[PDB]
Write an enzyme that holds these catalytic residues in place. Structure first.
Site, PDB file in Angstrom:
ATOM      1  N   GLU A 166     -17.968  10.278 -17.564  1.00  0.00           N
ATOM      2  CA  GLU A 166     -17.066   9.201 -17.177  1.00  0.00           C
ATOM      3  C   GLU A 166     -15.728   9.474 -17.847  1.00  0.00           C
ATOM      4  O   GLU A 166     -15.588   9.262 -19.065  1.00  0.00           O
ATOM      5  CB  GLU A 166     -17.601   7.845 -17.612  1.00  0.00           C
ATOM      6  N   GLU A 211     -28.945  -0.982 -15.142  1.00  0.00           N
ATOM      7  CA  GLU A 211     -28.361   0.323 -15.413  1.00  0.00           C
ATOM      8  C   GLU A 211     -28.595   0.716 -16.864  1.00  0.00           C
ATOM      9  O   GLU A 211     -28.269  -0.029 -17.785  1.00  0.00           O
ATOM     10  CB  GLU A 211     -26.860   0.270 -15.095  1.00  0.00           C
TER      11      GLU A 211
END
Length: 222
Positions: A203, A120
């Site tokens: 986020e 990621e």
């Protein structure tokens, strides 16, 4: 305008990109309102500890994420076959809340379309509040003509390499390939691995309403 509140509700924009509520880190209600070109977070209840995972990752993407693939995507594609991966995003921020705005780019040794990917890459365009990436800092890097604080670690499921901007980036158009190359140089992939999705969103750890992705693009040229 489509309102999505279901935990893993999705839709598409421009018959080309997937928009996902992706409320993976909390049971508290979150909704996004999806327009023709982006989305806005319209409900973002609750909060979670800043030393842990965030509430969610509402985002727009190209490629495939847990089997949900954007229309006409050319991903997954072997890294060595990529000529360019131009992408852009434009963000609207709020003074309140605790959150980041970030790209989430996934790599795998297989041409993966579903399941957890091995690597990621996060590119943090903005940080509000005492938020920090996974792992620990390993130095500075120059990518795409910008300077980044680099962090590496694991979230327990997959490896993560993050690039933190020094101050808020409202919008940027760049080549995702340059960041993919940095993942390789850090030992988190090889040129024979595959790029599986390019995602941009937020986020949130606390609050998040009013945040928006104004626009997004992604192409992966062979």
């Amino acid at each position: 305008n489509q309102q999505i509140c279901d935990r893993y509700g999705t839709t598409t924009i421009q018959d080309r990109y997937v928009v996902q509520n992706n409320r993976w880190g909390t049971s508290a209600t979150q909704c996004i309102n999806v327009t023709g070109n982006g989305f806005e977070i319209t409900q973002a209840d609750g909060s979670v500890p800043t030393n842990g995972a965030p509430k969610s990752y509402p985002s727009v993407y190209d490629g495939c994420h847990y089997g949900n693939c954007a229309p006409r995507t050319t991903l997954p594609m072997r890294i060595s076959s990529i000529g360019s991966a131009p992408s852009s995003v434009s963000y609207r921020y709020t003074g309140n809340g605790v959150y980041n705005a970030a790209y989430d780019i996934w790599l795998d040794p297989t041409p993966r379309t579903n399941g957890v990917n091995r690597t990621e890459i996060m590119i943090w365009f903005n940080r509000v509040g005492p938020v920090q990436p996974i792992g620990s800092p390993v130095g500075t890097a120059h990518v795409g003509g910008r300077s980044w604080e680099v962090w590496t670690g694991s979230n327990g499921s997959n490896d993560v390499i993050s690039f933190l901007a020094p101050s808020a980036i409202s919008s940027w158009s760049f080549d995702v390939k340059d960041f993919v190359d940095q993942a390789v140089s850090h030992g988190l992939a090889t040129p024979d691995w595959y790029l599986t999705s390019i995602q941009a969103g937020f986020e949130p750890w606390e609050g998040g309403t009013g945040l928006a992705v104004n626009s997004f693009s992604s192409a992966v040229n062979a």
